Structures are given as C-alpha cells and as structure tokens.
From Swiss-Prot, chains A, B:
3CL-PRO exists as monomer and homodimer. Only the homodimer shows catalytic activity. Interacts with host FBXO22; this interaction promotes the proteasomal degradation of nsp5. Residues 1-304 form the Peptidase C30 domain. It is found in: Host cytoplasm; Host Golgi apparatus; Host nucleus. The gene is rep. The lineage of its organism: Viruses, Riboviria, Orthornavirae, Pisuviricota, Pisoniviricetes. The active site is at residues 41, 145. This is 3C-like proteinase nsp5. Cleaves the C-terminus of replicase polyprotein at 11 sites. Recognizes substrates containing the core sequence [ILMVF]-Q-|-[SGACN]. Cleaves and inactivates human TRMT1, preventing tRNA guanine(26)-dimethylation of tRNAs. May cleave human NLRP1 in lung epithelial cells, thereby activating the NLRP1 inflammasome pathway. May cleave human GSDMD, triggering alternative GSDME-mediated epithelial cell death upon activation of the NLRP1 inflammasome, which may enhance the release interleukins 1B, 6, 16 and 18. Also able to bind an ADP-ribose-1''-phosphate (ADRP). It catalyses: TSAVLQ-|-SGFRK-NH2 and SGVTFQ-|-GKFKK the two peptides corresponding to the two self-cleavage sites of the SARS 3C-like proteinase are the two most reactive peptide substrates. The enzyme exhibits a strong preference for substrates containing Gln at P1 position and Leu at P2 position. It comes from Severe acute respiratory syndrome coronavirus 2 (2019-nCoV). The chain holds residues 3264 to 3567 of 7096 of the full protein.
Length: 304, 304
C-alpha cells in the first residue's frame, strides 16, 4: 500500500551522461553508441542567446572545439552535425554502458522521469509531466541544460525530453532527442509566454482510482454524470476535455475498483465545485495530475 | 529555478539489489562486498508472522536454503547469521558494483531516497522522510521488503533504511542496516499502532525558504515571533517544537534570502492560523515537511 510520486530507476541513464564544453559554455550531453547529443545552444555565449544565428555560429566551430568528458576521461570528437535544436557529436568510442533505447516524442499529459545533471554529473531524479501548454515544471539551475527525460519499459529506455530553456515565468521548455521543441518554444532568450496550464483530467481520474485502491475513499459520492455534463464542468475549471479514448484508457482501473469511469467523473465534478474542505487525498490538498493511468497500474502492480 | 521532490540518482544502489528466496518467501537483499543483507522474516511463512520465534525458525535453515540471485546469476551462500532483525548472508563473491558505503541510523525528520524493488529488480525511486513517530509513508507492495533507503554524499552511499513491515494503517516500518527497527515496531503481524504523525517544523521552514528563492512569496508578512510564542502555535497544530539547533541549521537559508528565521516562523504561524485560502506554495496546497534544510541548499545549489 501507499502511493508516491515515483521516478524510474536512473542507473541506465546515469551511464549515458557526459559533460560538453564549447568555449566558456558547459552543459550536459547524452552519450548513446558513438554519438553525444546536446543542446545546440552549447555554442552560444549568453550574449549570443538574445538573437542567435546557429548556422553562422556553428561555422566557427570545429570538432576539437567540442570538449566531451565522460567521468574524468576525454572523448575524441570525429564529427558534428546540427539536427533541429540538438547537436550530434560523433565520438570515436561507443558508450559501453549504452542501454537498449528509443527516441520517442511524447504527447501532453504523458509523464516521464528527469535526471537533473550538472557538468555531466547526476544530482537528482524526479517525475514530470508534459503540460498541456508544452512546458514542464522542473527543477533546473544554470548548467542543467542537456539533462534528459525518459521512461523505462523493462530494459529499454525511451528518451523523450532534453532540457533547453527556462521561460521568464520559471517553467521549462525543451526538445525531443531529434531536437524538435515541445510546443512553440525556441532556443532564443526572448519573450515566450506559456498558454493556459490546464489540468490533465484523465490523470486526475487515474489518481482518484489510485486513492480508492490505497484506501482514501471519502470523496466517493452517490452521483454519476455524462461526458458532456462533466466536460461543461471541466471547461469552467480549466481541465482538459475528457474523451471516450480517456474513458477507454481508464477501463482497467474501473474494472479493478468496480467504480464506473462516469461515477468517478461525478466524484471529480463534486471535488471541483466543492473543493477539498481542508481534507487530503493520498497526502495531497489538491487534485494531482502527474500520474497517468499507466503509472497508476504500474505502481499499483509492482512492475520492474 | 523550480523546486521538486527529488530522489538521489539510484544507479549505485540498483547495482546492489538481489533476490533472496527462503522456501516460498521471496524478497529483496542488499549485496555489499561479500554480504547480502535482508529482512530476517524471509524465513517466515505468513502463518509464522503471527507469532514468529526467529531463533527457532532459523535453526531449521541451512546456507543452501537461502537462494540469492543477482540478475540471472546465482550466488553461493557460505554462511549466514542473524543481527537484530536482519540476516547477513555471506556469499563467495564480492559484489563488483559495491559503491563506497556506510550504514547510518537516521533521526526523525531526516529524508532519504527509497529504491522500491520486487524480486531483486528496481521498479522506482522516491523521496521519504523518517516521520516523528518512526514510520515512513512509502509505496510498498508484497515482495518489496528488503528495498532500501539511502542518501548519497558525492560517491558514498549512506544506507539508512531497509523495508520490513506495513502497519494495518498502511504506513511503513523498517530497520537500519544493523537490523534495529526505527521506533517501537517489531517484525510480527500484530497490533502496532503509530503515534501522532507530527509535522517536521524545521523542514516546513526550509521549504518556505525554497519557495521564496524560487519566487513564491505571497505568504511573507509584516510580523515576527519568538521561539516560545511560535512553539505555543506549533503545539496546537501538532508541529514539532522548534529549537535553537533548528534555527542554527536554517542560518544559511536565512543569510541567502535575508529573511530572519523568526520572521519566517511568523509567516508559518499565520499560515497555520489562517490556512492557504485556496492558494499554493511550490505547487502544494499544504505545508510540505519532507525537505530538510540540507535538501533545500543542495537542490538550490545543484550539488552532484
Ligand atoms: C553533417 O556533418 C557530419 O555528418 N559530420 C560528420 S564527419 C564524420 C566522420 N562523422 C560525422 C557525423 C556522423 C554522425 C553524426 C554526426 C556527425
Ligand atoms: C554466526 O554465523 C556465522 O558467522 N556464519 C558464518 S560461517 C562463514 C564461513 N561465514 C559466516 C558469516 C560471516 C559473516 C556474516 C555472516 C556469516
């Protein structure tokens, strides 16, 4: 019993982190096979970041200008290329700790683990979600760029995020491992305002199922609703519309608990309209939306 | 910027987890040098757990009855002994992945990372605190016993917790790595009620400093207090008494922010008396008490 905000074990990713320095800029790189992936803004000064022309800045860089250090051992850079907003540094040594991996581009509402790193050295691991406005709410200081987000399926690491930017509002933006930003964000120090940070409704419902499984049941009520009626309330409270696809995804949790999805929606509707009245659910005083239905199943079944 | 409930990177501990089976009971063991540490209740049936005589049960066990598997490779058990509530299984092979380590016995209010494991296989990592009633609020299913709690100082793992028990109230009890339970708990399936789960005041104050550093400032007020006056309010709200030792420990955060500890206590007093009024601090609607002053400094400075 018990339900915690749980990250994936980070060892397989720790074995991939390196330091990348270009001139006076040091950040983190991801070493998989004989390629090191890092943000392309490693080539910028903070002055450059105001209005960078990355193709023009990169012309002034040679392989020997990219200093790549794995622990206290230097890697030899034998090529470099820019792909969207990432640099690929070809090294002469395959990472011996390369896990089975994939690059995936996640959808808003999906969760992942971040291995926060500085100078190629892991500092901490925590669980994130891709927000509906394509930001993440991370914990990133100067030097953390190139830290990555990932999911693990048994022995396969699916890398989905690389950290690039903090918005003036202190939320975070980054790319997939093909170097395409999530959302509209760019690797330029300019006005970038985030849109509405809506609540991920299917994730709140998953978490309420988690709560019932783990014995927190006070919020269950005598009511039901419909998707359309629920969605009128979701809209008012800046929750994402619930779709039949979401209802289908919650089927296993419905089955396990015997609480119909629309009955849990009626519980959530009352919690939105009435608040918590100073009560808590799984140790939270607000409705948690950074567990997916798959997260709740995995944690509630003990998947390794 | 940003402040997250962050666990230590878990790789150094992942490299130590093994499966231990005795008869029909499988749980996790910690392999350091040529010793495997596990809960002594590995020798019990669930029937046994009602009234176990561990010395008598252990007489019926031989080295060859303790099946220890590290990944898919079997370890040879060449001795066993009981130390308090843990078994030490002497194996013929030193763990090649043994990190620098220590065994530490933590104080209530101290935080640590848990690597939840099943059948010797890591499932997840999360951050815990030792509660003032010597329970922890974990996420542990059947098979998770022998999962461990730890802190990392650069390259040294300080192991402080091994999981043994879930109380009928769904909170968790365990031992240090010498096999001594935290608090009054025993490895018997019997009536064990936890005492008051008081709030760790010094940790709440650390977290309010974290909030100010990361730009959440609405709760700062025009007031101050004294330790004695604050403590009258702490008592009423089932907060731990704040001591001068705690004030001293918060000195660096006071210095960094320029907010005197007693001024932050007056902010906390008002939050206790007035509640949050539907507002949030670092994404929480309640006062978070599972970050220590050292955690806040570490996360706010990017220690690796
Ligand atoms: C467009 O630039 C390159 O292809 N540069 C070179 S030269 C070399 C010997 N390898 C690369 C290379 C290969 C894979 C990934 C990145 C770089
Ligand atoms: C009290 O029982 C033992 O000392 N048993 C044996 S016999 C052996 C060859 N080693 C041990 C041993 C050594 C260290 C840790 C646990 C066991």
């Amino acid at each position: 019993s018990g339900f915690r905000k749980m990250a994936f074990p980070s060892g397989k990713v720790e074995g991939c982190m390196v330091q990348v320095t270009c001139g006076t800029t040091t950040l983190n790189g991801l070493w998989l096979d004989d390629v090191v992936y890092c943000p392309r803004h490693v080539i910028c000064t903070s002055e450059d970041m105001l209005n960078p022309n990355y193709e023009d800045l990169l012309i002034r860089k040679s392989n020997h200008n990219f200093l790549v250090q794995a622990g206290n051992v230097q890697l030899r850079v034998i090529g470099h290329s820019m792909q969207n907003c990432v640099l690929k540094l070809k090294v002469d040594t395959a990472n011996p700790k390369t896990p089975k991996y994939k690059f995936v581009r996640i959808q808003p509402g999906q969760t992942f683990s971040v291995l926060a790193c500085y100078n190629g050295s892991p500092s901490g691991v925590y669980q994130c979600a891709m927000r509906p406005n394509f930001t993440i709410k991370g914990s990133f200081l100067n030097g953390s760029c190139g830290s990555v987000g990932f999911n693990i399926d048994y022995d396969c690491v699916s890398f989905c995020y690389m950290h690039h930017m903090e918005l003036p509002t202190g939320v975070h933006a980054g790319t997939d491992l093909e170097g395409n930003f999530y959302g509209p964000f760019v690797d330029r120090q300019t006005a970038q305002a985030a849109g509405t940070d809506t609540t991920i409704t299917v994730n709140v419902l998953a978490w309420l199922y988690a709560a019932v499984i783990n014995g927190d049941r006070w919020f269950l009520n005598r009511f039901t609703t419909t998707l359309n009626d629920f969605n009128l309330v979701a809209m008012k409270y800046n929750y994402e519309p619930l779709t039949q696809d979401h209802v289908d995804i919650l089927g296993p949790l419905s089955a396990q608990t015997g609480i119909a999805v629309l009955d849990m929606c009626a519980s959530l509707k009352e919690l939105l309209q009435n608040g918590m009245n100073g009560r808590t659910i799984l140790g939270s005083a607000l409705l948690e939306d950074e567990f997916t239905p798959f997260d709740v199943v995995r944690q509630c079944s003990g998947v390794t």
